[PDB]
Design brief:
beta-barrel; hydrolase/hydrolase inhibitor; homodimer; 1 helix; mainly beta; about 100 residues; binds ligand 2NC
Chain lengths: ~100, ~100
């Protein structure tokens, strides 16, 4: 799709078998989802924004369907204010910025 | 232009007479610039990401040239780690997300 930016670029994603809403975020290196459980093992990581740093769970090689486009990659889980799809998965679905 | 997302989408902006590098952030409602003096009136604001909130100075009707495209709008000035161009200016330069 072509998505304009008059409103937040919120889209539906499928992850671990369930639906979530997430913001397509070109200013995020990584994809960060609110607390939830995902299968597999995870490792602790710290990430920063902006207002400071938070602790997250890093899960690797997770399938994520974003507006019907498939990605498989790293998902960070933790107390983010907003679910965000970052560049690690945006590149997999071929997303670009255009003007 | 088209900007891919393999690396952070950093571009040159001109604001207040100065050339700076800034991140195009579709996950930002507003535009947040590192320190910088600027003009003759502002209002206090707090903005959050992630990590928590920071205090900023809101300046209105500031011209901002982004990759050679003229925009004019609100800019928030404060101790952000990265200059961030948000949706309020990205819309003005006709930026879209495409996949
Ligand atoms: C989660 C809240 C929504 C997404 C977030 C993404 N902003 C970028 C800005 C760039 C960093 C300062 C971000 O935090 N990116 C992180 C996301 C986490 C991540 N791991 O991907 C990042 O890339 N962090 C890198 C480190 C910074 C790297 N980026 C860079 N150098 N440009 C990381 N590995 O930790 N947006 C925002 O932070 C903006 N917040 C908002 O738009 C809204 N605030 C709230 C709380 O939703 C609005 C109501 O104010 C800020 C700028 C105010 C207008």
């Amino acid at each position: 799709p072509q998505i304009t930016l008059w409103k937040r670029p919120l889209v539906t994603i499928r992850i671990g078998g369930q639906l979530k809403e997430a913001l397509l975020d070109t200013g995020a290196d990584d994809t960060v989802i609110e607390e939830l459980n995902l299968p597999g093992c995870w490792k602790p990581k710290l990430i920063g924004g902006x207002g400071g740093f938070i602790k997250v769970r890093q899960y690797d090689q997770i399938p994520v369907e974003i507006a019907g486009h498939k990605a498989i990659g790293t998902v960070l889980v933790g107390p983010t204010p907003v679910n965000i799809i970052g560049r690690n998965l945006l590149t997999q679905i071929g997303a670009t910025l255009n003007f």
